[PDB]
Design a protein around this ligand. Structure first.
Ligand SMILES: CCCCCCCCCCCCCCCCCC(=O)OC[C@H](COP(=O)([O-])OCC(O)COP(=O)([O-])OC[C@@H](COC(=O)CCCCCCCCCCCCCCCCC)OC(=O)CCCCCCCCCCCCCCCCC)OC(=O)CCCCCCCCCCCCCCCCC
Ligand SMILES: CCCCCCCCCCCCCCCCCC(=O)OC[C@H](COP(=O)([O-])OCC(O)COP(=O)([O-])OC[C@@H](COC(=O)CCCCCCCCCCCCCCCCC)OC(=O)CCCCCCCCCCCCCCCCC)OC(=O)CCCCCCCCCCCCCCCCC
Ligand SMILES: CCCCCCCCCCCCCCCCCC(=O)OC[C@H](COP(=O)([O-])OCC(O)COP(=O)([O-])OC[C@@H](COC(=O)CCCCCCCCCCCCCCCCC)OC(=O)CCCCCCCCCCCCCCCCC)OC(=O)CCCCCCCCCCCCCCCCC
Ligand SMILES: CCCCCCCCCCCCCCCCCC(=O)OC[C@H](COP(=O)(O)OCCN)OC(=O)CCCCCCCCCCCCCCCCC
Ligand SMILES: CCCCCCCCCCCCCCCCCC(=O)OC[C@H](COP(=O)(O)OCCN)OC(=O)CCCCCCCCCCCCCCCCC
Ligand SMILES: CCCCCCCCCCCCCCCCCC(=O)OC[C@H](COP(=O)(O)OCCN)OC(=O)CCCCCCCCCCCCCCCCC
Ligand SMILES: CCCCCCCCCCCCCCCCCC(=O)OC[C@H](COP(=O)(O)OCCN)OC(=O)CCCCCCCCCCCCCCCCC
Ligand SMILES: CCCCCCCCCCCCO[C@@H]1O[C@H](CO)[C@@H](O[C@H]2O[C@H](CO)[C@@H](O)[C@H](O)[C@H]2O)[C@H](O)[C@H]1O
Ligand SMILES: CCCCCCCCCCCCO[C@@H]1O[C@H](CO)[C@@H](O[C@H]2O[C@H](CO)[C@@H](O)[C@H](O)[C@H]2O)[C@H](O)[C@H]1O
Ligand SMILES: CCCCCCCCCCCCO[C@@H]1O[C@H](CO)[C@@H](O[C@H]2O[C@H](CO)[C@@H](O)[C@H](O)[C@H]2O)[C@H](O)[C@H]1O
Ligand SMILES: N=C(N)NC(=N)NCCc1ccc(I)c(Cl)c1
Lengths: 174, 48, 347, 100, 83, 171, 98, 307
């Protein structure tokens, strides 16, 4: 049911993580992280994080992960090894995949589960806020406040990005 | 030209926002009763 | 490196540390570590060689992993308390994750393996920053979260570091590795007393920094990175051998020298808390450090090792290295014991 | 639901067009480093760092609605100037050159 | 001054794109402080009512607080209408 | 922990204002001017009591004022008002600026037959003052007694007795 | 806790185990490091959004910006390693054994 | 009802792309003192159909990774169609509060199809050509995003239909023609169009081919539709929405035709020269104009409404 959409996305989130965490060829590992990034945006979108969700797409996927794939094609792998052809990768992938399914089966059967810690299984919708009738996006108001309240955050963040340029030029000059 | 139009758009936004402010007490009065009715209804079924 | 860039990068290393020390918000603490780590990599890499690249990469992976674990502890803390204030954490799992993250950053055993390798692979001046200034930011966080730290975890980390640091230094002929293992052992004393009296942690940290800076400066003045190279000092700068001897005996904790003071006060604070077995075990285990400090004094000052003919050419030129603050640092490293009550300024 | 339907339609159609594009009647019975160039790597990294600053500027249309306009304008310009300084540094350090 | 004008002519001839960039960037930094209209930006933003204006309990000592929206007391937006 | 007290289903019943949002939007400016007093009394109650159960009576008065407001439009200006809110209802954003002709006809009708004056730009966003016989709540947050502050320290700072007293040191 | 936190916490653990169990490519370990950031971004965003902590809405963006800058630094170290040995294999980074 | 609406967008987009190939050939031809297609159907009107059938029954002529060889064209075509769903013409298919950010986010993903097809080429030299194309594309993404932000400081929001309201009285090209100029050139470079068509240039110094071609030509139309909305706003009459659609279509056609006009008029940039055009010319001006457009609404008291 669509009432479990956030949970279903979170399940797909984990499988994508088991994908690249078992570490196939970095070409495929990069693909697994991209799928998890998109699914991670969807989870954030369903909690009212419209701007935050789109930043994952714009910055994490369209920026960072593009640079990761660019670097992989240039300095790591040019031709991917067949996926899961390695034994450890296949074993690690299968091991993680089975753990996720056993988690998902029990939480859905009992509507709760104790995997080390206690988790409710009624659906994430139950904790949502019941009153909202403002004429603005609260997420947008909070993010916009970076320029009024977060003067100090802007200074240190902007400085660190400038030092990022300086440092990387030093590192690579060799 | 952009300055003039945006100033008028700010006046039009204020008028729209003031219409919402006029209606907010009525909507708040309704939201309170709807929430309490639902809670009361959930309470009858719990007793059973 | 351009001299102006080197200054700006050094100031960024300091600024990142300062942000950690003045922040009340956990995000700013995390930012301070991120900024600090970004600025330190270029001074590890500055001599451009495979060893310096390996050290910078090993350092990056360790610190990045530790910062991810720190951000986890922060987010778990937010979930269970709804606030970001830098103070005691509000969840035992968060406390373990932050303690482990900060232990990794400090290079405490059993997260110590990177310290000898990274220090060996970078220049002396960069190792000086790594083993002194970089301890400030993590220790200042531990100073503020210690009420919520698991006592068994922190004391286990301390005991392991004193053992690993002591044993690891016995097998070393490289001066940078000797300093690395010496650093690991001294971190253990600092964290062992933290649950009882953080002031004594600060005292040990300050004195350790002073003696560590002295030794690195004296190594830099002569461009010595190995024991055998250091053994040629007597036939060039005899005064330097005496200063090295005095400083090493101080780092060994021998009275009447300054390095006795932190061990002396830590033992006092632990005994006031009916901790007797642990301080006694620590003091006896620190004899391992004294052994390989004494070994250096034998080959540097108390005996004259064989020389080389080309050394005579060195007799005709003076020391031109800055040796900044060395006369002050060596006097503080050795002659401060009579002023021990001054530790109350750190209260 | 509508956006999910639209996305599923677009990519489902794209899959189908690729399918028939690869399978139609034919009627016949019979990981090293890629000649690595450092300059192209620095373009990608420079794009990344500038992209992160753009992420910080995107809120600006909303920030202009604040009553704290004195602070907001000063920080907006400060961020853009620091972006310009980054470009100026790369420019003067030969980071935008394609020779050698 | 003459050395300043000679420098400006040189860059105008060789790097008009950079000259324009710096001139525009300089105007952006300077003109807000010289503009008589910058003060209205603060006032208009403050005059936009995003949330409900919660009324005050009348204690009998608030002659400056209107009792009805159409009473004369309180902020006026007549300056905004004429803008 | 105790029982959440809830009003009975009968105590919540009231006659509803069952008109759409374009109708409310069309009438909003005159509604704010006409029904200000019961509306502001209700909103004061809500923000002071912080409890919807404590303002049900004032909430019912809000409904009665609105119903009487719309009964007066129906009696006198039904046709001009219907044209106006139908114009508003067509727009996907329900824009005032698309309906100035029809708004003028409705505005002229209420002024002629009811004396109603549309409040000016900025009026309805004012903070006004309300006179209420309701007592001001004492502990709206239901706070417990706060813990007692630690015993303060007062006195004259004198030198430490015999100094640091650290082991053998005499100062 | 709510049901989503189970999987988001699991994803971080999976990527942490991935990071701590190296294979050969240094790039593969960098991806696990960025996976850890992704799960941190999602968990922080969910907590902040659900609790309506308005001013904290900017925090995931700051985390994203700084973590991307850290990843850029890591990628630069990877290419320098690759230039030295021709691969990003971590078994080559063993000179400081001695 | 909604699925009908989706198809009344997807199908016309593909048909418009098909006949843009004819218009391009005929416009280029007449600028070259010739005719272009005029035999295959009257005035060449069946030429796109003959080309389309021909390409799809051609032999579909080893990939270094089958999954990525197929992913790249699906990504390209799927993303290209997705960029259309928030466009207000005048009503969008999906009305997004952050539609401008969505288009920026989706367009940033399009570079993966270049990267993946370079990986799947199984050839060292094709991978290098793909990486050069990627570096060009991300370089011009920088100015496009900053130019867009500058314009939105006059509009007030990330909603695409608000650009219509912002230009009720006047086109945004008048206050922002310096940005319009760099925006227009940036779109050419972003779509690898002449004089920025370096992939086809540097390269020469069936169904799968057709699919990539459709994706690129759909992007070309879409970018010029975006340009029309961004800088040449058409007035919307809610009771006669078709009036908006006619005027806005004409502007988009003319902008698209000017892409062909430009291809016919200039030689090609060198790769290093188009990089300098961005990093040393456009980006400095874009940064300065971004500061200027942050200050201007504040100093004129012309800040737009949030909503
Ligand atoms: C919830 C928690 C999360 C759960 C995760 C679910 C799975 C999702 C994916 C997670 C990421 C997994 C990453 C695995 C990986 O990439 O490592 C590759 C790693 C090294 O990669 P490799 O270069 O291809 O070499 C393969 C072998 O190591 C051979 O290499 P070799 O050259 O060294 O050959 C000799 C061999 C010698 O092997 C032995 O002698 C071991 C025998 C010990 C008997 C006891 O060496 C080893 O086996 C090294 C390991 C020795 C054991 C270490 C002690 C533990 O290979 C493995 O070790 C495979 C193990 C995978 C099992 C995953 C189990 C996850 C559980 C984690 C603990 C959580 C508990 C709660
Ligand atoms: C209570 C606990 C136990 C006691 C705690 C005491 C803590 C230490 C106190 C500070 C001691 C700093 C050393 C005293 C100065 C001695 C060196 C000297 O006379 O330089 C004169 C200095 C240049 O002497 P020089 O011929 O270059 O020889 C330098 C020495 O070899 C030495 O050159 P350097 O490479 O070693 O650098 C020394 C100095 C940098 O060299 C200097 O320019 C002297 C600055 C010393 C400032 C002392 C301030 C103390 C009062 C704090 C307020 O560093 C500083 O800036 C001090 C921080 O002449 C000046 O310009 C006077 C400073 C004008 C401001
Ligand atoms: C300049 C002139 C200023 C002036 O007019 O007054 C002068 C001053 C007169 O002051 P006064 O008010 O008339 O009362 C003086 C009473 O004798 C002092 O009566 P008091 O009631 O103040 O008792 C002295 C008190 C004062 O508080 C102190 O702790 C000051 C520390 C004195 C250090 C003495 C250095 C010699 C170390 C032992 C050898 O000391 C203590 O509380 C504990 C004794 C600490 C001695 C250090 C032993 C513990 C550390 C273990 C490591 C060192 C062992 C070797 O003359 C002195 O007493 C000199 C004080 C000694 C230190 C300054 C002179 C440097 C001596 C260098 C010795 C180097 C050792 C060679 C091996
Ligand atoms: C109290 C302790 C104060 C310690 C001061 C020590 C000053 C540094 C040692 C002086 C020796 C001369 C010198 O210049 O130091 C070496 C080093 C500079 O490096 P160098 O190789 O000489 O050339 C740099 C150009 N790339 O110098 C440096 O780079 C500075 C590194 C030391 C900074 C950390 C000092 C410890 C932390 C102090 C906080 C105290 C609490
Ligand atoms: C490349 C493949 C294409 C990936 C597509 C990414 C989808 C991103 C859509 C986000 C756009 C958006 O913000 O609006 C969509 C909608 C929220 O609508 P919005 O107007 O912004 O706010 C609520 C109403 N005011 O938000 C939604 O409809 C919720 C959709 C959640 C499911 C998206 C899961 C995507 C997973 C891709 C892998
Ligand atoms: C220097 C050469 C560079 C080449 C670049 C390519 C330029 C192509 C530009 C194409 C656009 C030209 C305009 C075409 C007008 C089409 C008919 C039309 O729309 O007329 C209506 C227009 C005024 O109406 P309207 O657009 O709605 O403006 C009101 C503000 N919203 O009437 C006004 O005309
Ligand atoms: C309308 C004008 C009317 C005339 C009067 C106007 C007067 C007011 C304006 C005053 C502004 C003057 C500033 C001009 C400075 C230009 C300096 C210069 O000439 O730099 C060029 C040079 C790069 O040139 P290069 O190609 O590398 O070498 C030449 C070999 N052929 O050197 C360089 O390295 C380039 C400089 C570094 C790059 C900085 C880029 C600027 C920062 C980008 C953002 C723009 C500013 C903030 C926004
Ligand atoms: C490398 C670091 C670079 C940092 C660059 C920072 C540049 C900042 C330049 C402008 C900063 C101030 O810019 C502008 O100045 C005028 C001064 O009258 C302020 O004042 C103006 O607006 C305020 C509203 O807040 C009014 O009360 C005031 O009457 C009006 O004059 C503006 O509020 C401010 O927006
Ligand atoms: C090194 C592993 C790295 C991956 C980390 C993975 C994420 C870890 C998530 C930790 C969040 C759960 O944290 C845990 O939640 C439960 C839920 O009440 C808390 O509560 C639990 O212990 C306390 C004990 O007094 C009580 O609340 C109760 O007995 C029990 O429910 C725990 O005190 C807390 O430690
Ligand atoms: C857009 C919808 C279009 C609908 C059109 C439907 C028409 C279906 C009938 C298609 C007939 C295609 O005809 C056939 O195409 C294939 C394309 O590789 C050609 O090629 C094929 O045959 C040759 C030998 O003859 C083989 O070596 C080759 O490997 C094989 O591909 C044939 O030479 C041609 O005879
Ligand atoms: N570049 C041009 N304008 N001419 C040209 N030969 N284009 C390519 C021809 C083509 C490709 C795909 C399809 I579907 C169609 Cl219908 C036509």
């Amino acid at each position: 049911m669509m009432l479990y959409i956030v949970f279903i996305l979170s399940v797909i989130f984990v499988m994508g993580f088991v994908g690249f965490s078992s570490k196939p060829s970095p070409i495929y590992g990069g693909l697994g992280l991209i799928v998890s990034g998109g699914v991670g945006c969807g989870i954030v979108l369903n909690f009212g994080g419209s701007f935050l969700g789109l930043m994952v797409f714009l910055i994490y996927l369209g920026g960072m992960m593009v640079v990761f794939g660019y670097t992989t094609a240039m300095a790591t792998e040019q031709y991917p090894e067949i996926w899961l052809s390695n034994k450890a990768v296949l074993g690690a992938f299968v091991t993680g995949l089975l753990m996720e399914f056993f988690m998902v089966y029990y939480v859905l059967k009992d509507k709760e589960v104790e995997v080390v810690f206690e988790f409710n299984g009624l659906g994430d919708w139950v904790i949502y806020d019941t009153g909202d009738s403002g004429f603005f996006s609260e997420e947008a108001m909070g993010i916009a406040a970076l320029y009024s309240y977060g003067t100090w955050l802007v200074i240190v963040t902007g400085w660190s990005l400038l030092i990022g340029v300086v440092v990387i030029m030093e590192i690579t000059r060799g | 030209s952009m300055m003039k139009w945006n100033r008028e758009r700010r006046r039009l936004q204020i008028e729209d926002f003031e219409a919402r402010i006029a209606l907010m007490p009525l909507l708040q009065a309704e939201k309170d009763r709807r929430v309490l009715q639902m809670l009361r209804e959930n309470l009858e079924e719990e007793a059973t | 490196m351009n001299p102006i860039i080197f200054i700006i990068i050094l100031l960024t290393i300091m600024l990142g540390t300062i942000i950690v020390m003045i922040s009340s918000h956990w995000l700013l603490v995390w930012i301070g570590f991120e900024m600090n780590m970004l600025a330190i990599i270029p001074i590890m890499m500055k001599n451009h060689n495979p060893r310096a690249t390996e050290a910078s990469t090993k350092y990056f992976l360790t610190q990045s992993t530790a910062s991810m674990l720190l951000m986890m502890a922060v987010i778990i803390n937010l979930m269970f308390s709804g606030q970001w204030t830098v103070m005691k954490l509000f969840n035992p799992m968060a406390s373990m994750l932050m303690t482990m993250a900060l232990a990794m950053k400090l290079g405490m055993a059993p997260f110590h393996f990177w310290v000898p390798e990274v220090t060996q692979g970078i220049p002396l001046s960069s190792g000086l920053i790594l083993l002194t200034w970089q301890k400030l930011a993590p220790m200042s966080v531990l100073y503020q979260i210690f009420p919520s730290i698991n006592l068994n975890l922190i004391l286990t980390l301390s005991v392991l570091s004193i053992l690993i640091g002591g044993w690891g230094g016995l097998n070393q002929t490289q001066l940078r590795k000797i300093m690395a293992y010496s650093s690991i052992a001294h971190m253990g004393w600092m964290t062992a007393v933290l649950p009882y009296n953080p002031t004594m942690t600060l005292l040990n940290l300050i004195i350790y920094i002073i003696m560590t800076s002295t030794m690195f400066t004296m190594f830099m003045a002569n461009s010595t990175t190995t024991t055998l190279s250091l053994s040629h000092t007597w036939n060039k700068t005899p005064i330097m051998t005496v200063l090295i001897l005095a400083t090493l005996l101080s780092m060994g904790g021998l009275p009447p020298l300054s390095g006795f003071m932190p061990k002396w006060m830590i033992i006092q604070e632990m005994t006031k808390n009916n901790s007797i077995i642990l301080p006694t075990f620590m003091a006896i285990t620190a004899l391992l450090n004294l052994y390989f400090y004494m070994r250096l004094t034998y080959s540097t000052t108390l005996t004259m090792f064989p020389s080389t003919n080309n050394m005579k050419m060195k007799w005709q030129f003076p020391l031109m290295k800055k040796m900044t603050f060395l006369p002050t640092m060596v006097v503080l490293s050795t002659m401060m014991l009579p002023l021990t009550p001054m530790l109350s300024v750190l209260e | 639901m509508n956006l999910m339907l639209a996305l599923l339609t677009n990519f489902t159609l794209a899959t189908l067009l690729v399918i028939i594009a690869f399978w139609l009647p034919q009627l016949n019975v019979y990981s090293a480093r890629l000649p690595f160039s450092m300059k192209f790597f620095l373009v990608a990294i420079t794009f990344l760092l500038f992209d992160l600053e753009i992420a910080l500027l995107l809120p600006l249309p909303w920030a202009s609605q604040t009553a704290n306009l004195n602070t907001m304008l000063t920080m907006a310009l400060f961020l853009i100037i620091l972006l310009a300084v980054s470009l100026a540094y790369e420019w003067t350090q030969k980071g935008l050159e394609w020779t050698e | 001054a003459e050395r300043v004008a000679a420098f400006l002519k040189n860059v105008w001839a060789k790097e008009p794109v950079l000259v324009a960039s710096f001139a525009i960037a300089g105007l952006a930094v300077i003109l807000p402080t010289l503009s008589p209209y910058t003060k209205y930006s603060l006032m208009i933003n403050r005059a936009t009512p995003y949330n409900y204006p919660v009324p005050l309990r009348d204690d009998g000592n608030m002659p400056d607080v209107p009792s009805h929206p159409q009473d004369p007391q309180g902020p006026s937006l007549e300056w905004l209408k004429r803008l | 922990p105790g029982i959440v007290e809830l009003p009975s289903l009968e105590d919540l019943k009231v006659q509803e204002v069952k008109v759409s949002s374009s109708v409310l939007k069309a009438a909003a400016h005159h509604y704010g001017a006409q029904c200000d007093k019961p509306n502001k009394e209700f909103m004061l109650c809500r923000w002071e009591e912080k409890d919807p159960r404590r303002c049900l009576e004032e909430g019912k008065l809000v409904n009665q004022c609105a119903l009487e407001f719309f009964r007066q439009i129906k009696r006198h200006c039904a046709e001009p008002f219907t044209e106006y809110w139908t114009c508003i209802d067509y727009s996907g954003l329900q824009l005032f600026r698309r309906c100035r002709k029809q708004q003028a006809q409705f505005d002229e009708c209420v002024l002629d037959k009811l004396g109603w004056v549309r409040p000016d730009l900025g009026d309805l966003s004012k903070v006004t003052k309300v006179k209420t016989d309701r007592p001001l709540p004492e502990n709206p947050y239901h706070s417990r007694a706060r813990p007692e502050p630690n015993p303060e320290v007062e006195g004259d700072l004198k030198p430490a007795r015999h100094g640091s007293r650290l082991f053998f040191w005499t100062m | 806790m709510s049901m989503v936190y189970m999987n988001i916490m699991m994803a971080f653990t999976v990527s942490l185990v991935g990071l701590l169990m190296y294979r050969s490519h240094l790039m593969s370990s960098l991806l696990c490091l960025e996976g850890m950031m992704l799960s941190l971004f999602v968990m922080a965003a969910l907590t902040i959004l659900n609790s309506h902590f308005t001013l904290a809405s900017m925090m995931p963006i700051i985390l994203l910006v700084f973590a991307a800058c850290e990843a850029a630094l890591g990628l630069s170290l990877l290419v320098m390693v690759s230039n030295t040995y021709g691969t990003d294999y971590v078994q080559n980074l063993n000179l400081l054994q001695c | 009802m909604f699925m009908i609406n989706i198809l009344m967008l997807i199908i016309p987009i593909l048909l418009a792309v098909a006949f843009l190939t004819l218009v391009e050939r005929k416009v280029l031809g007449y600028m070259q003192l010739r005719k272009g297609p005029n035999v295959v159907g009257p005035y060449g009107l069946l030429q796109p159909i003959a080309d389309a059938i021909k390409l799809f029954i051609k032999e579909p002529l080893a990939t270094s990774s089958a999954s990525m060889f197929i992913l790249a064209p699906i990504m390209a075509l799927g993303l290209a169609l997705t960029m259309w769903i928030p466009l207000p013409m005048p009503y969008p298919l999906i009305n997004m509060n952050l539609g401008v950010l969505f288009m920026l986010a989706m367009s940033s993903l399009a570079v993966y199809s270049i990267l993946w097809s370079g990986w799947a080429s199984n050839s060292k030299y094709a991978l290098i050509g793909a990486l050069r194309a990627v570096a060009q594309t991300i370089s011009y993404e920088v100015t496009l995003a900053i130019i867009l932000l500058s314009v939105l400081l006059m509009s007030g929001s990330f909603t695409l239909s608000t650009l219509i309201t912002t230009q009720e009285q006047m086109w945004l090209i008048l206050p922002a023609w310096p940005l319009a100029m760099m925006w227009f050139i940036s779109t050419l470079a972003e779509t690898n169009r002449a004089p920025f068509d370096l992939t086809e240039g540097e390269s020469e110094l069936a169904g799968p081919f057709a699919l990539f071609f459709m994706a690129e030509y759909a992007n070309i139309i879409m970018m010029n539709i975006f340009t029309a909305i961004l800088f040449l706003g058409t007035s919307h009459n809610p009771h006669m929405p078709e009036l908006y659609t006619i005027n806005f279509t004409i502007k988009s056609l003319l902008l698209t035709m000017s892409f062909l006009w430009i291809r016919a008029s200039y030689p090609r940039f060198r790769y290093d020269q188009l990089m300098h055009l961005l990093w040393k010319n456009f980006l400095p001006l874009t940064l300065a104009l971004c500061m200027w457009h942050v200050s201007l609404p504040i100093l004129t008291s012309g800040i737009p409404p949030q909503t």
